[model samples]
Target: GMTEYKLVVVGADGVGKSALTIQLIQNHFVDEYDPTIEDSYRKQVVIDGETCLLDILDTAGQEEYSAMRDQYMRTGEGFLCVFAINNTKSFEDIHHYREQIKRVKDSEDVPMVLVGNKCDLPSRTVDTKQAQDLARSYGIPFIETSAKTRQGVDDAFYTLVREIRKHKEK
Candidate 1:
């Protein structure tokens, strides 16, 4: 059977949520897009031969769009949780974001990739080690990337697709 997987990019506001997405899907750099309308999705690159019509759910930072996050969780197959390196608050919000996703997703085994976005900033100081610990706790991959530099950006996704392709869809 054909499959259409959904992915929601979530995190605190201004945490490079759109940046990471545009780099991955549109291959463009857009710093600011005002009032990201809810449920407005876009298709993404096909990974590992699987047709993943990413429902890049336009969501606000950690606390702003709880309801919308919930709605997507009902149907989303995976999630790309993001946070900026420059803002410490955004990093802290990952805890709440993870919990929110858990509640919305009926299955406890939902896959995720923790993205430390905006890693190319000159004033960056996020302890990648710490973020990696969090991802480990959640049992997923931790990818520190800068959409601006195109560093570890595509690798984060394309690698995941390779992993996803291995599983036999039941």
Candidate 2:
């Protein structure tokens, strides 16, 4: 069996980063705006023939925590780079998150998934096309998700695990 590894979920504030983790782990929805800069957490996940001890680090979605994010990335084998689809600013900031992970993890092949979350609340700001484009440009998988309705949340997470396992097989 593979050792218990870490999979860190990251992105801008109010992107439902915590909600996504809760939805993925406990199948619960956390109302938006409950999380901010001064937050970090760890949790474990077990699913479908795999027991992923996800060290679910919910970092401060602020630039002041750049070094902290780097520290977390150094130990993470996979990442879910997320953004709230209704918040264009959050969407715009995902590039910085990905860049930081690249700089810290220092491994381009490390599995990363770009998640455009909150698709359940449509008709406001960011859409799927832009996110798909960015992920494509970065050579990472993309998925539109919503933690509230639990839409695409499973795929958002498990896809990264499947890909990471595939990489190890090669």
lDDT string, candidate 1, 1-170, tens digits: 44555566778777877677677777777767653544445665666566565556556533445676467566655677788888888889898877877778765566678888887777876787888898899888898899887788777666545434543253
Backbone clash tally (model 2): 0
Clashing pairs in 2: none
Best by lDDT: 2
TM-score of each: 0.80, 0.83
RMSD of each: 3.1, 2.6
Candidate 2 lDDT, tens digit per residue, 1-170? 53455677888777888888877777788776466644445545566777666556666545655676557568877889988878899888888878777878776677889998878885748767777889899999999888999999888777888777777788
Winner by TM-score: 2
Cα lDDT of model 1 overall?
0.70
Candidate 2 residue-wise lDDT at 106: 77
